């Protein structure tokens, strides 16, 4: 009576993950990228709720090498220091067991020992190793411009539209768009800088609130500025300034949020409590100079909800060119410093804290900084985008005729 | 031109005919040749894609058209449901949702009939 | 992992209210997970109660009014926690309480079917009983 | 609702049984909307096996089912020690939907 009837143009996604192209408008976006698309260009959905989540979203491992692409062919530095850490002269290690006599004596003496299980030596052995690579050296400029990431043919981005968006959680006004909005590289620790910020009101997440050790993201509403220079008498010294009384403001409606939702209990701020020193200090790259600047006067807001330089806060800071890569582990070396005068103007958008979640009598909670990732950098540029693969073809059983 | 097969998404299934017929029939240095070629891979590949489903619904018998009769009756456990909730009480998401293992069963049938 | 876990074992005066808290460990948030309620009388089958599917309490039809659904995020010290709320307690709900989560991730799992959905995984349940 | 019933409702078996375990609809369940379930005594009744044919990780590789329009097949394959627990069949096809009955393995 009534049979197959085969359909094409059908709105069912899927959730796949691909590779994902670039960009907006002479050494990298030449070779890897297009050029611009006249936008507008969005489609408004009606009476859909895609189920977003931003901790889990795989747009960010393919961006975050994708900027490993960039910065090792736009910034060489002079020499990389990286590991090596291999399993000499042999693959004795084998399958498993135990004895096996290798190293003591230079690289090359007995050291037979004992397992049976295995659990690693230098779980199976490895012995280390220091590649290190000497690489040219022009003095490069820099600039990050912005990549709009457009998506492949038969693919869509979605993305949310309502600004109390925390990550997890369904979205109801979901458009969907074919390439992204402006997104610009910048890495910097300790503090976000240059990012989108939001329309209606600042936003605090976490991937896991209770846990005290995701990087809790705070994105601000009031587009805060910062300005880095390079002053003289020294050669390596420069300072920033920030305007006290909008710094007071965003710190005081940021302990607001925190305390109207999370807890119910009493603030307070301190510094970065050491480390490895790029997370001690505010590092941003800015012109080819790695700037390092101390950021203990910006964190005191021990607040009951209710001799610094009160006006012009300096942040004094070092250009240090021994850097430790964000891009894997290990030193690099640049060229030798610059002469003249670097303006390093840029929007204060962001924070990357973390916690240290205790203790009974306290009552208090200590709310140190964190940072160091430079994918948590990107999941707030990263903010509502959710890559999805469409199946056009349907199948519906009707009359037909 | 493909960016608009999901505009009628979240609504019922006629009223997304009805939209795919509506938008059916609403649509000199080395940087010049760098920013001139990937313009037009882009379009071969969305040519190459377009023509690539083209012939996949050539096969069953179905090549240029958005709908069309094909030959295969049902199985009638292929959801026993009555043609006014078919196509007024349930979106394409429940129903991509409900029949997978089946869909692959009708793409096998729809080759075996569109042979003979 | 899901370790959820309930409040203690009580029993109950007749003609009274009772609100059996869940707790739920390892859950990111109720955006993307659900919280389905189960009831067991001694001796009996298994039997549905309520859904927080998308923030939505609502109990089944045939035993509105009495028992409806609240649900707590994550707050700061806190957990996930949903809280069941109980009136007008009779002599034959005596009976093994249940919570359960499933994901709600992906649309096309297979664990929901537009809130009507297999249970992923199961509390420990209480008993409340009628002196 | 859509009843369901749970048929045989109480068995015996041997250690290294396959116990095929049926589970009838009163409608016609197109889609496979139906989940099976164990419960030990006095722990947490855990899910086996959703949508009909598909395995959750948590559970063995031992344990499969199928499907008969109104029938729906659990079938224990190698039976150990450990899975002598009630068994229970969930419809989730309409709101809301109820279990089986039980089946009480013993030897």
């Known amino acids: 009576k009534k049979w197959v009837t085969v359909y094409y143009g059908v709105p069912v996604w899927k959730e796949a993950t691909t590779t994902l192209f670039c960009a907006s408008d002479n050494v990298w976006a030449t070779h890897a990228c297009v050029p611009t698309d006249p936008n507008p260009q969005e489609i408004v959905l009606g009476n859909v709720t895609e189920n977003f989540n931003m901790w889990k979203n795989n747009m960010v491992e393919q961006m975050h090498e994708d900027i490993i692409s960039l910065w090792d062919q736009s910034l060489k530095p002079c020499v990389k220091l990286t590991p090596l850490c291999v399993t000499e002269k042999m693959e004795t290690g084998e399958m498993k067991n135990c004895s096996f006599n290798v190293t003591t004596s230079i690289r090359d003496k007995i050291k037979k020992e004992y397992a049976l299980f295995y659990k690693l030596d230098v779980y199976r052995l490895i012995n280390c190793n220091t590649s290190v690579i000497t690489q040219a050296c022009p003095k490069v400029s820099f600039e990050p411009i912005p990549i709009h990431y457009c998506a492949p043919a038969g693919f869509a981005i979605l993305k949310c539209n309502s600004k109390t968006f925390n990550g997890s959680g369904p979205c109801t006004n979901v458009s969907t768009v074919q390439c992204t909005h402006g997104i610009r590289p910048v890495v910097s620790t300790q503090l976000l800088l240059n990012g989108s910020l939001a329309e209606e009101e600042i936003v605090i997440r976490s991937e896991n609130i209770t846990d005290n050790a995701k990087t809790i993201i705070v994105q601000l509403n009031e587009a805060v500025e910062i300005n880095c220079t390079r002053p003289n008498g020294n050669i390596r010294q420069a300072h920033c300034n920030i305007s006290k009384a909008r710094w007071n403001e965003t710190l005081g409606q940021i302990v607001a949020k925190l305390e109207e939702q999370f807890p119910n209990k009493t603030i307070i701020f301190n510094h970065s409590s050491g480390g490895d020193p790029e997370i001690v200090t505010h590092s941003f790259n800015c012109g080819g100079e790695f700037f390092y600047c101390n950021t203990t006067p910006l964190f005191n807001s021990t607040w009951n909800n209710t001799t610094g330089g009160e006006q012009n806060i300096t942040l004094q800071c070092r250009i240090k060119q021994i850097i430790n890569m964000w891009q894997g582990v290990g030193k690099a070396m640049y060229a030798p410093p610059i002469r003249g005068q670097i303006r390093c103007s840029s929007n204060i958008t962001g924070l990357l804290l973390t916690r240290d979640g205790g203790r009974d009598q306290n009552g208090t909670e200590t709310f140190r900084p964190g940072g160091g990732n430079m994918r948590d950098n990107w999941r707030s540029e990263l903010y509502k985008y959710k890559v999805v693969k469409i199946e056009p073809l349907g199948i519906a059983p009707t009359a037909c005729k | 031109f493909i960016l608009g097969f999901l505009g009628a998404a979240g609504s019922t299934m006629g009223a997304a005919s009805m939209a795919l017929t509506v938008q059916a029939r609403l649509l000199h240095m080395l940087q010049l040749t760098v920013w001139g070629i990937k313009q037009l891979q882009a379009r071969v590949l969305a040519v190459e894609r377009y023509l690539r489903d083209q012939q996949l619904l050539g096969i069953w018998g179905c090549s240029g058209k958005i709908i069309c009769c094909t030959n295969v009756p049902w199985n009638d456990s292929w959801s026993n449901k009555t043609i006014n909730e078919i196509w007024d009480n349930m979106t394409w998401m429940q129903w991509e949702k409900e029949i997978d293992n089946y869909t692959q069963h009708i793409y096998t049938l729809l080759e075996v009939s569109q042979i003979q | 992992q899901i370790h959820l876990v309930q409040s203690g074992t009580e029993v109950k005066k007749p003609g009274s209210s009772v609100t059996v808290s869940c707790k739920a460990y390892?859950?990111?948030?109720?955006?993307?997970?659900?919280v389905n309620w189960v009831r067991q009388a001694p001796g009996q089958s298994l039997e549905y109660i309520g859904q927080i599917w998308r923030w939505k309490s609502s109990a089944s039809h045939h035993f509105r009014g009495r028992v409806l659904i609240s649900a707590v995020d994550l707050t700061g010290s806190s957990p996930p926690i949903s809280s069941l709320e109980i009136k007008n307690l009779t002599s034959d709900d005596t009976a093994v309480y249940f919570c359960t989560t499933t994901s709600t991730y992906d649309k096309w799992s297979g664990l929901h079917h537009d809130g009507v959905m297999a249970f992923s995984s199961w509390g420990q349940g209480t008993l409340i009983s009628v002196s | 609702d859509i009843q369901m019933t749970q048929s045989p409702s109480t068995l015996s078996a041997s250690i290294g049984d396959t116990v095929r375990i049926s589970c009838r609809a009163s409608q016609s369940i197109t889609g496979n909307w139906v989940a099976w379930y164990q419960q030990r005594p006095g722990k947490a009744p855990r899910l086996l096996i959703y949508?009909?044919?598909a395995l959750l990780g948590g559970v063995p590789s031992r344990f499969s089912g199928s499907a008969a329009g109104t029938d729906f097949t659990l079938t224990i394959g190698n039976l150990q020690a450990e899975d002598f627990g009630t068994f229970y069949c969930q419809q989730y096809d309409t709101y809301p939907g109820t279990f089986g009955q039980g089946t009480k393995v013993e030897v």
């Open positions: 390892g859950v990111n948030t109720f955006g993307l997970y659900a």
């Open positions: 949508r009909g044919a």
